[PDB]
Design a protein around this ligand. Sequence first.
Ligand SMILES: CCCCCCCCO[C@@H]1O[C@H](CO)[C@@H](O)[C@H](O)[C@H]1O
Ligand SMILES: CCCCCCCCO[C@@H]1O[C@H](CO)[C@@H](O)[C@H](O)[C@H]1O
Ligand SMILES: CCCCCCCCO[C@@H]1O[C@H](CO)[C@@H](O)[C@H](O)[C@H]1O
Length: 324
Amino acid sequence: RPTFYRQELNKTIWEVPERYQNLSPVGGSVCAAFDTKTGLRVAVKKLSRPFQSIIHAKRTYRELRLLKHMKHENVIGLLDVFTPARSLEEFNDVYLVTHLMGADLNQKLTDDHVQFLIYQILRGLKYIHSADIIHRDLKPSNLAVNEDCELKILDATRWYRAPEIMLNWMHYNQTVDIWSVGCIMAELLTGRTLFPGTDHIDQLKLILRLVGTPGAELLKKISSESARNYIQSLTQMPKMNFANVFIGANPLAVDLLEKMLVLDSDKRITAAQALAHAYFAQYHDPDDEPVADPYDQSLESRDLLIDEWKSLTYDEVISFVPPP
Ligand SMILES: CCCCCCCCO[C@@H]1O[C@H](CO)[C@@H](O)[C@H](O)[C@H]1O
Ligand SMILES: CCCCCCCCO[C@@H]1O[C@H](CO)[C@@H](O)[C@H](O)[C@H]1O
Ligand SMILES: CCCCCCCCO[C@@H]1O[C@H](CO)[C@@H](O)[C@H](O)[C@H]1O
């Protein structure tokens, strides 16, 4: 067990191992710190009220288990997790430690830089998706970069949300995340938000303007009678020429965008397919685009008692093994 020290911070007593020095509030709650053991600048998140209720406790367990699973260069991972508690009976607080990411993606980038950034997002998404996990909220603020432009996917604007999420469809496929990637890529290339909707319905209006209204193949897949009737009450419109939306862009970028931003989610390119697209030729390397171990989301989604979630979470803290 490390020697701990106590200090009042962000108006609560933080108790952390002495290896973590010079904590400073960056806003549960996150503080930047310097890890003297590794020489790393880190973020230390003290979870807020982690076991106050069944819902808090279930959320805490899910967050910790997910972060423990993610072991990929382009996905945020867990450097450390600790509690001052020496037993289950004393266990009230949980602290999560990650790389301190100084910048994110949130005015246009060069094509060579867009290649590199989107490659890394897709490499990370291949890994997430291979664990049967959907991110569901990819956006520039969830994409951290360092001073060598190395990117990590992290963890409320609607500008990057797939249209089926906007319609509360459910049955979401992992290409909801590919829609988001397309929106981000477009914005990096043009320096302008692709679909800057003013409210919920305006977002959908702007989307349909680019991609066109549903065709017959897509209409055939709609179970909702009201949706079906609304769509066939609509005035049919063609897909815009993406070449004209992205004037002067690399033709391979435009092609890839056309393959991401398709209304029908079944027809969107996958992360793995996208990595093999010619746009990424200078980066693609099959030998090093790894997949994840299986992740069991059913362990979440149980209806357990607070003390059961708390004990399971404690076990996950004790079993943590740091990365190299
Ligand atoms: C840290 C690893 C990268 C993130 C991959 C896991 C995606 C996070 O999980 C997401 O977050 C939300 C929780 O509020 C939920 O709406 C969804 O169940 C889920 O898509
Ligand atoms: C998949 C089909 C989605 C159903 C959309 C529900 C209705 C959309 O919104 C409606 O349409 C009109 C045009 O914006 C407006 O008159 C109204 O603001 C609104 O009631
Ligand atoms: C007028 C607005 C229409 C929006 C159409 C969105 C269609 C998204 O695509 C759909 O999404 C689902 C979720 O994975 C799937 O089950 C379908 O097979 C698929 O066609």
